[PDB]
Design a protein around this ligand. Structure first.
Ligand SMILES: *[B]([O])([O])[C]([C][C]([C])[C])[N]C(=O)[C]([C]C1=C2[C]=[C][C]=[C]C2=[C][C]=[C]1)[N]C(=O)N1[C][C]O[C][C]1
Ligand SMILES: *[B]([O])([O])[C]([C][C]([C])[C])[N]C(=O)[C]([C]C1=C2[C]=[C][C]=[C]C2=[C][C]=[C]1)[N]C(=O)N1[C][C]O[C][C]1
Ligand SMILES: *[B]([O])([O])[C]([C][C]([C])[C])[N]C(=O)[C]([C]C1=C2[C]=[C][C]=[C]C2=[C][C]=[C]1)[N]C(=O)N1[C][C]O[C][C]1
Lengths: 220, 222, 220, 220, 220, 220, 222, 222
């Protein structure tokens, strides 16, 4: 039952995404903010890809960590083949949609993942930060403001549909985020935070560590 | 052969002769040695004819192919890199006889100062490259003579039309010393070809303006 | 059940095409017009292939964008092997029919796409613009006036069976188009538009941006 | 059920042939006449193969056009390996029977096509024009007068069983043909016509264009 | 039934794990302690991997001993390619999760194993010892204090949730361990014990033999 | 039914083991004794592997003889790569467990065999002779005293649970063996006997022929 | 060898001798060195006979093959490129001894001005090519002498028959100097072959008109 | 060429000239021979330009690539090993002409004594490497003269700014003897480039401080 077969695959994957933890990305004044609940100290859900492009995913770790590596692999080669400036993260979104697409068909069991690729304008330049969401079945869409993934999104995404301050501050957007995350449930300085700082010269990535994070974190 | 490239305030000009020789035997009098690679890139090529033509033809395809695929043209840095790779990819052949060295001229529509968006990149038989930043460069059997004449005549470069005359004059000076370069043929009405690139794009300089410019040089030196 | 099996594949694909958005192409004075509803800023459904030939598709993006790339790859190589002037888009329609044909048989799940390849006479020359439609199963047909694909076609195609002005203007055919599109449903300057401008010297493609588009767009 | 399996294959194929348009080939004074209804201007069902041999087929285009190319590939190679005069079209009928034979077994879904290979004696020489019909399952037969294929053949083939003038004229045989074609159903100068002109020096193929065609065409 | 299929695989594996013997690792003052019941003299369940990283697994021996070897293989080459200092056991945890992940999909029968990779700070350095648990399906988690696997874990893991002395002694943690192990059931100097001695200069591994063991072992 | 599938494999194999004849190995003063009922003169169930390690198996001949050869192959190579002294038969037991493990999953029908690998200390050295049993499913265990395999083991193994003289004589242990074997049932000088003579300088293997055997054999 | 090609108002003519030599030893007196590749293309081939024949034979198949496949003949540009590739694909062999250089002549039924649709493309051992646009070209051991005679006699070219005589005369001049070219054999009645191409197609020039034209040259020079 | 590296109490400085020569013919006057590989690593490269550029380019990508994948920078030992591997991976090419030798300078943020965290690693055509621990090292056609000058002037090294002057002076001393090294161009305003690394990271020394330091040497020697 080719048709019915595809529905079981969808189901299996979609469930796995639900039982997984939650991850959120959103656009703010300084660029893009990555916030995800992660009790682990080393198994990270958010990573750098290239100069101004960033990765974040929810789901079965070993699976998205794999895709993460692939992305880093693709980007670095691409950059070397052409120039650094020719990597787009729109590109990476396609590659991911392509890969996940094949997986959902060729692989025995589909990947239990949902991805987010985010780009934010080069140093001097000023451009609207970009966010891409790639689903398990290879579908790809670009939200203009914020992206939610993992667990129950409705309450988390709904909270943002209002709390989203168009041009928020780093400490304001973090506040808005962690709050909106708690809506689908705690939220202590025991999670994972990183940003795409558009103001950085070359590598627009920065992890926000423990102590420095506190100075921005939201009271619950 | 001599291909020459100049940087002026607006953008860049590239021009090269049309001689093709085989031994000391003229075998070509109308070769088009300078190509419009894309909207903002002109590429000139010296050495082995079969390879020169193929470099150009292939390069152009590569650039437009990236564009159609990714939806955006390559960075100028990207464009440089690709050409360089292609050159290295011929080192084997070059070693045997099939040698061919390109000169790249372009206008970077993303340069900070749009009055310095003109670029001249010279290339290395091994795939090396140097962004010239000295306003002028040449490649070919006579490039030595051109560069040296173009050294003196460079102050006179004020604008497009201004630079273009220096270009044609260097090529005239090249042909005057390099028997493999070939100056303007009045008896036949054949003249060096050229390309200009500014913020508006790359355009073939009509032979009229060149032919005129040439006779100017001939008279004044005459 | 080999025969019954092929019926399920067809079904699966045909449903996917339905739930997807709508795309329309039509012949007009200046060449060929491409209009498709697309909220995304980056994920394009309409693309250039070669000098005088153009691509547009409805369905699962990652799938048609793949075919799009393949087309560009085929055309560019073919052109280099022979001459630019030897690429026909009648060729590309074949290639696509061949590929989608294979896929509908060999691949586990058939592609949920529907394609349109359009050619318009070289610069000086004058020739009747040509339109090709390739379906999911590898079937290929050439409409002489307009092609509709994605979502519910009847109301959109029906509206055209009347509103089609044989030798319309760019602004007139666009009006006719966006109107005919609304019939199967809005339609703001937030969609995707491009043309095969037969009047162009070499590359007969042009995207119509935001501001320039409004000066042509239809009042609803 | 290997036996029952083969019956479903046959079924699937045979239906596809039925729903496709109709194609007819027949022997006449000048050589062989190819006539098929085809609305398309570019997607042709009738083609040249070698010097004196010709191709025509009905069914799923992408499939027969494939075999068409293969034929041309085979013939040209065989010709270069030995001599032009050593290619027979009886050979090509074999090769097609072989291919379609394998396909009907090996490929998941069998080809929905029916083929006709036609040869007509070399220039000076005089020999009875030859017609071969290859079916989807790899079966091969040679009619001595005329071949019908695609859609409902009985009414079209029946009309010929009488209308066939043994040694007709080009304008007479075309008249007989288009008439016999209408029997299974119009028939305007909007179809596809070509001949194997035995009178030609080398390449015995010729397409009959639009204007020239009218001067021969049958009143309905 | 792709979804239902994966549940059978899980089940088969899960049961095998249960019927297998019990293995425990925990963090203590000196580094990390490895304790597992093993009547065999040679067939070991606990092994060294690299300088400061260690291996322990419960389940079907031939299966985990295979993964063990692979680990040693990976670590040794990685070290040689870069530097000894660049192997992390967080790395090995990934590799194992990747491997077991593939196996649970690709291999006919999934591995009946459960793994533990443990790292303990370099000589001079002081860092919180790390523990990783990799399950049969390729899932990966990092407990901060102790890891239980094989047989019935609840009563063994429960006993630890209380008896775990944060900064225990070698002889104290051993006491705590063997006691907690007996909770899920005896426990004589006829089992397997080894430690990651953070105090060692380079190779932070040490097996605890027979007679030396007694001097630390718990009275039942 | 992956779970239920593995149960059928186990069944098939375990039955084949049962209807096969019986083989016994046990530790005695001089090293290790191999005794198996074998009417055949040439088709042997007991063989040498390396210097101090030995092979014995019950079940489908062509299958174990294959593994036998593989062992000899492995041992000889390993020895030549490193040193003779580096071959352990503990090693061979692993390899055998690995192979039979793969077979029980990958091969259509699992091997109907059960293996015994035995090692006995190098010449001057004195060490407790070692016995390894590898089952059809790739499971591996090491009995300290004796190993039984093929046919009904309980009566044969039970007889040993008592008759086993810890440090028996060659003629005593043979007596004990042949008697214990008849308990699961005769037993005349028409069977197969060999020993791992720890007293030998290099190759610790020796077959006990016909006449020499009598001088040791047990009265029934 | 000498193969020669002429451009006149209507179209093009190509003619070549029939000598085949081996050392300084005549081993052929009736070689057909000029071929009708397709309806608007004639190709002449110089150098190594085994390769020359195979080039022509193979090339014609390729062009006809594309046509039968895609339903339309290649662009003239296409035709040029394919022959070039083929020539490159022989560089290896050429290097060892098996060298063979083609001359292409054709009528481009798509040229703007149908009175300039005549084309002569010369080819390079490495696969390079130059569209001649000078009215005449030659290839072979005697091409040097032909080209130079045909330089003087070019004004005389008025039409088909007019051009053809200059062709034949250049081939006469070549054999006059190149002992490997071979002029008209009256004693044996063997004469250079030729091909004409105009809007109507490519046709073999009957030896009658050639033999005639040849005797005219012989007598006038006599 | 001459690239030079110095160890001072805070960290390390590396500086190299900008000449590029081809034969005895200046073909470059502003080459950037010293690169910041990552935050704590600077890498200088001598010999064949095409390879040198490519080493640097490629190496930096490798380092950054490990980081992004494993989440942590390589050990300094790791970084050395990789560069070494790369160099060996070029032995084949080096044998034929394409020779290129790197000099590594870094700050190991994990050194016991953060006042000795400065590293200088020299490299061998075969992929060998020796951690210098002698405070200074050089590579290139003039490295012999540099090392020798820098032997005498090493006591003077007190701090960053202090070391940097000795570096510049040795490069001055190199160009004084090696015609292929090239000193400071006052007429053109081109000066050696440099990089400094301390606990804070690696930073490009502004040409101001170099140009200044240069004229100091020029005047004092003058
Ligand atoms: B010139 O060197 O740029 C010029 C090149 C151009 C045709 C792209 N042409 C040449 O002068 C070549 C001649 C040449 C040639 C001539 C005739 C037939 C075939 C042919 C094939 C390749 C090259 N000669 C030349 O001087 N260079 C000097 C150094 O580089 C290689 C040969
Ligand atoms: B002509 O030089 O192009 C001519 C060519 C044509 C016959 C295709 N033929 C030649 O004169 C060849 C001779 C030749 C040959 C001669 C005899 C037996 C076999 C044979 C096979 C190949 C070629 N000679 C010749 O002059 N050229 C000079 C330069 O190119 C290679 C040989
Ligand atoms: B230098 O030796 O480090 C310097 C290096 C730098 C360019 C990275 N470069 C050279 O001096 C080279 C010149 C050179 C060159 C010159 C012109 C065009 C292309 C080109 C390509 C590579 C190198 N010359 C040189 O002296 N070396 C000394 C020994 O190693 C190879 C050549």
């Amino acid at each position: 039952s080719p048709e019915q077969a595809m529905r079981e695959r969808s189901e299996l994957a979609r469930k796995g995404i639900a039982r997984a933890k939650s991850v959120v990305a959103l656009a703010y004044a300084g660029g893009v903010l990555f916030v995800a609940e992660n009790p682990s100290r080393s198994l990270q859900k958010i990573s750098e890809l290239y100069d101004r492009v960033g990765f974040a995913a929810a789901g079965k770790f070993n699976e998205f960590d794999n895709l993460r590596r692939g992305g880093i692999q693709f980007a670095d080669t691409r950059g070397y083949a052409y120039d650094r400036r020719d990597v787009t993260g729109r590109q990476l979104a396609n590659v991911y949609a392509q890969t996940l697409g094949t997986i959902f068909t060729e692989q025995a069991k589909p990947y239990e993942v949902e991805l987010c690729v985010a780009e934010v304008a080069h140093y001097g330049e000023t451009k609207r930060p970009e966010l891409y969401r790639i689903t398990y079945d290879g579908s790809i869409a670009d939200e203009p403001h914020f992206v939610v993934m993992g667990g129950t999104t409705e309450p988390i995404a709904n909270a943002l549909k209002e709390s989203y301050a168009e041009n928020a501050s780093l400490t304001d957007a973090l506040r808005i985020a962690v709050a909106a995350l708690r809506a689908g449930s705690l939220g202590v300085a025991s999670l994972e935070v990183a940003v795409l700082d558009a103001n950085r010269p070359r590598r627009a990535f920065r992890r926000i560590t423990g102590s420095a994070l506190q100075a921005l974190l939201v009271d619950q | 052969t001599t291909i020459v490239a100049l940087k002026y305030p607006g953008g860049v000009v590239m021009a090269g002769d049309r001689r093709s020789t085989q031994g000391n035997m003229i075998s070509g009098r109308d070769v088009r040695k300078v190509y419009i690679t894309d909207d903002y890139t002109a590429t000139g090529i010296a050495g082995t004819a079969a390879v020169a033509v193929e470099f150009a033809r292939l390069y152009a395809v590569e650039l437009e192919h990236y564009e159609k695929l990714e939806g955006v043209p390559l960075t100028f840095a990207g464009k440089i890199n690709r050409l360089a790779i292609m050159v290295r990819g011929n080192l084997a052949a070059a070693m045997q006889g099939l040698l061919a060295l390109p000169l790249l001229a372009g206008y970077d529509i993303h340069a900070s100062d749009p009055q310095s968006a003109g670029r001249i990149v010279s290339f290395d038989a091994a795939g090396g490259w140097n962004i010239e930043e000295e306003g002028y460069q040449a490649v070919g059997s006579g490039s030595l003579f051109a560069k040296s004449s173009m050294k003196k005549l460079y102050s006179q470069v004020t604008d497009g039309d201004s630079g273009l005359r220096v270009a044609v004059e260097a090529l005239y000076d090249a042909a005057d010393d390099d028997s493999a370069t070939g100056g303007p043929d009045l008896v036949r009405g054949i003249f060096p070809t050229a390309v200009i690139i500014d913020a508006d794009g790359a355009v073939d300089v009509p032979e009229s303006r060149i032919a005129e410019l040439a006779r100017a040089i001939i008279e004044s030196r005459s």
